[PDB]
């Protein structure tokens, strides 16, 4: 049998079976966590659709098979020694019959803590610690670069377009919020803090958008055409941030994510976009 993880008790983490310390064949069914596993040099043999559509992650998991959580046959045939899932998956019992499962409840641990937590689970403390130390220094330095342009008290709002809907996001639901609000310590407008931050996201009707945007808005979308009717509208064009050219449009296929690999890309992209806003 496998050498075992110490299986520390951590908020949001549930273990089904004896988790290996050094898994050799991991199936990641929670796109939130795939890039954490890759940062810790895990061999991923299965990943999901969102992972394959994230160009930053995809380059690192070319040999992994795309699977869904319902793919019991394909997952079995991949011969995993570990499956990682989100807590809202509904067939965890069946997955746990294939291999040991780590189930993670989103948001119980923050985007940085999740990495050090995996460091404890897999005895990869050194790799996690080095990444986190560098991240702390780099983000502080980049915070200074961007605030030199915007001022330190500029407000930012995180937004996403999905289907025909409009979402606002807080500091810990992806779409750049970890970068903007946690790493760069930008404030959000009061209405966003009051109405969005606690839930993490808020589906909004388009006509109230001006009320939630201050100095800057970051907008995630999967394709560049979705926002067209909004962007040309008198409503949108009336927003001061839009008039000032303080709109930063980002690609959701990577900006949905919160993992170290995706966030490295988001960090450089957002740094450059803020600097570029004053060209």
Q: Closest Cα partner for 32 from 48, 46, 16? A: 48
Work out the number of other CB atoms within 10 angstroms of the CB of residue 181: 22
Q: Is 86 in the site for Na ion (CB under 5 A)?
A: yes
Binding-site partner at residue 86 among Na ion, Zn ion, none, CB < 5 to 8 Å by type: Na ion
Q: Minimum CB separation from Zn ion for residue 17, in Å?
A: 8
Residue span binding Na ion (CB under 5 A) among the ranges 10-18, 122-130, 209-217, 221-229 = 209-217
Q: Is 30 in the site for Na ion (CB under 5 A)?
A: yes
Work out the number of other CB atoms within 10 angstroms of the CB of residue 92: 19
Q: Minimum CB separation from Zn ion for residue 213, in Å?
A: 15
User: Do you know the residue count of the chain?
Assistant: 279
Instruction: Give the rounded distance of the alpha carbon of 82 from its chain centre.
Output: 22
Residues that bind Zn ion (CB under 5 A): 18, 90, 164-165
Q: Is 157 in the site for Na ion (CB under 5 A)?
A: no
Q: Minimum CB separation from Na ion for residue 32, in Å?
A: 3
At a CB cut-off of 8 Å and minimum separation 6, what does 82 contact?
19, 20, 23, 25, 26, 27, 99, 100, 101, 102
Which CB sits closer to Na ion, 79 or 243?
243
Q: Minimum CB separation from Zn ion for residue 164, in Å?
A: 5
Which CB sits closer to Zn ion, 64 or 239?
239
Flag whether 232 is marked binding: yes
Task: State how far the Cα of 103 lies from the Cα of 117, in Å rounded to an integer.
Answer: 13
Which positions lie near Na ion, rule CB under 5 A? 30, 32, 86, 155, 214
Binding site residue list: 18, 73, 90, 97, 143, 165, 185, 222, 232, 245-246, 278
């Amino acid at each position: 049998s496998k050498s075992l993880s110490p299986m520390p008790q951590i908020a949001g983490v549930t273990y089904y079976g004896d988790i290996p310390k050094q898994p050799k064949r991991v199936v990641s069914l929670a796109s939130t966590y795939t890039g954490y596993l890759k940062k810790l040099d895990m061999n991923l043999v299965g990943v999901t659709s969102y992972d394959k559509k994230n160009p930053i992650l995809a380059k690192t998991v070319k040999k992994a098979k795309q699977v869904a959580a319902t793919d019991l046959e394909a997952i079995t045939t991949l011969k995993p020694d570990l499956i990682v899932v989100g807590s809202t998956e509904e067939n965890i019992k069946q997955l746990a019959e294939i291999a040991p499962v780590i189930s993670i409840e989103y948001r119980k641990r923050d985007y940085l803590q999740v990495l050090s937590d995996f460091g404890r689970i897999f005895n990869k403390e050194g790799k996690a610690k080095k990444w986190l130390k560098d991240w702390k220094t780099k983000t502080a330095a980049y915070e200074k670069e961007v605030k030199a342009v915007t001022g330190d008290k500029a407000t930012f709002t995180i937004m996403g377009l999905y289907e025909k809907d409009v979402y606002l996001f807080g500091k810990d639901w992806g779409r750049g919020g970890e970068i903007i609000h946690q790493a760069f310590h930008y404030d959000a407008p009061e209405k966003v803090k009051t109405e969005v931050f606690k839930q993490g996201y808020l589906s909004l009707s388009q006509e109230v958008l001006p009320d939630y945007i201050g100095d800057y808005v970051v907008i995630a979308a999967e394709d560049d055409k979705t926002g067209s009717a909004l962007y040309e509208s008198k409503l949108w064009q009336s927003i001061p941030a839009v008039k000032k050219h303080h709109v930063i449009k980002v690609n959701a296929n990577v900006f949905y994510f919160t993992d170290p690999l995706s966030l490295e890309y988001q960090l450089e992209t957002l740094r450059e976009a803020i600097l570029s806003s004053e060209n």
